[PDB]
């Protein structure tokens, strides 16, 4: 049966996971030395390997060949965990199991020995959704549980949990994956999938991933569906609404030089062409940052913008740094309020007019 790239390429060993070297090393060393805790909380942004790392740790603990740092993935228990069948690996959703009876039976069945494995792993997802009474009741279990149960906790944000929970759990901060790691993983996946890919497309997808690899895979699947089974630069640009042209620079120049009619015409034609407005704001922010950098250090400018070098240089010679900071601040304010505006076009126009109000 066909599966999406996120499900197809879920890591099955501690070597298939990309990034998060520190937490993986800590887990492997703990498993090797036998110093294993009873509460592993994983904190980080979405699409960084919370569930993947938790399942890998569960496989390592429950492997039939003893506690192994890198589970083989072929045992009966290993395969069942990989398929989400292992009874001793209870995957609980915090939001669903918020009622009193749910937690009461959760802490009442701990005494029963594991059915198959040597540890009755409890993988609780988005633990921050549990009620305060749930945390209070589970403190005792999280402190001194029996030596047959391990609690694996996953939450997008750890600060919302009670301080006691953080005290009783080993916290692993999954770092957001950088652009290079996402690009390398996408390149490897596409090569193993026998799908042609261009470096520009991979770079754009990694940039749009915003640090989450699941989002990168979802964008790749979207491009595949729209790109007639081909990861082409033009298809990815059309899907993502990336200008990658001089329109952003011209609009920034118009904004700095007031001339509201030019800015309005540029926005009108951009809307007619149907682009992504968040992409336009990000491009403007990048251009303003580059202008500030060249004002500080002229050598900090690349050659990709060579065709627009001199004009850009003119801004670095014409706009004082304080005005650049003001424009960047206004663009960021527009970025923050763009989702909440009545319309995306209205938000962009308000941001640009506010920036236009500023002048020497």
């Amino acid at each position: 049966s066909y599966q999406v790239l996120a499900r197809k390429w879920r890591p099955q060993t501690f070597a298939d996971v990309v990034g998060q070297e520190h937490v993986l090393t800590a887990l492997a060393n703990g498993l090797s030395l036998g110093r294993i805790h009873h509460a592993y909380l994983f904190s980080g942004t979405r699409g960084v390997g919370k569930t993947s790392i938790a399942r890998l740790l569960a496989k390592g603990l429950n492997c039939e060949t003893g506690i192994t740092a890198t589970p083989c993935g072929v045992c009966d228990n290993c395969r069942e965990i990989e398929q989400g069948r292992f009874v001793d690996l209870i995957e609980i959703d915090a939001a669903s199991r918020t009622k009193v009876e749910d937690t009461r039976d959760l802490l009442d069945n701990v005494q029963y020995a594991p059915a198959r494995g040597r540890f009755k792993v409890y993988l609780i997802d988005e633990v921050h959704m549990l009620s305060r009474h749930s945390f209070n009741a589970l403190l005792k279990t999280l402190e001194e549980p029996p030596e047959h149960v391990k609690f694996l906790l996953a939450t997008t944000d750890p600060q919302k949990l009670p301080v006691t929970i953080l005290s009783r759990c080993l916290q692993f901060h999954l770092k957001a994956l950088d652009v290079e790691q996402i690009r390398h993983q996408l390149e490897h996946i596409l090569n193993e999938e026998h799908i042609a890919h261009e470096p520009r497309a991979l770079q754009l997808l990694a940039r749009a991933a915003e640090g989450s690899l699941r989002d990168a895979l979802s964008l790749t699947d979207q491009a595949i569906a729209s790109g007639d089974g081909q990861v082409s630069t033009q298809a990815v640009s059309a899907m993502l609404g990336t200008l990658d042209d001089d329109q952003a620079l011209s609009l920034v120049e118009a904004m700095v030089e007031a001339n509201g009619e030019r800015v309005m015409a540029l926005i009108n034609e951009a809307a007619a062409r149907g682009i992504e407005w968040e992409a336009l704001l990000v491009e403007m922010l990048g251009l303003l940052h580059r202008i500030a950098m060249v004002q500080l250090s002229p050598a900090a400018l690349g050659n990709d913008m060579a065709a627009i070098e001199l004009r850009m240089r003119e801004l670095a010679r014409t706009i004082p740094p304080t005005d650049i900071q003001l424009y960047y601040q206004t663009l960021l304010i527009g970025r923050k309020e763009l989702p909440y505006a009545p319309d995306r076009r209205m938000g962009v126009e308000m941001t640009l007019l506010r920036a236009l109000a500023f002048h020497p």
């Binding site: 005005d323 003001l326 601040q329």
Partner: protein, 35 residues
């Protein structure tokens, strides 16, 4: 008032002033406070 102050206000910078000196005591030897 000045361009500096107006820009800092627009950026959200409070520009805290001293007003009540003397409270700053200890190993403080600020000869030139730029004021």
């Amino acid at each position: 008032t000045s361009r500096r102050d107006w820009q800092l206000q627009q950026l959200g910078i409070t520009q805290w002033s001293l007003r009540r000196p003397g409270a700053l005591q200890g190993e403080i030897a600020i000869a030139i406070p730029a004021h």
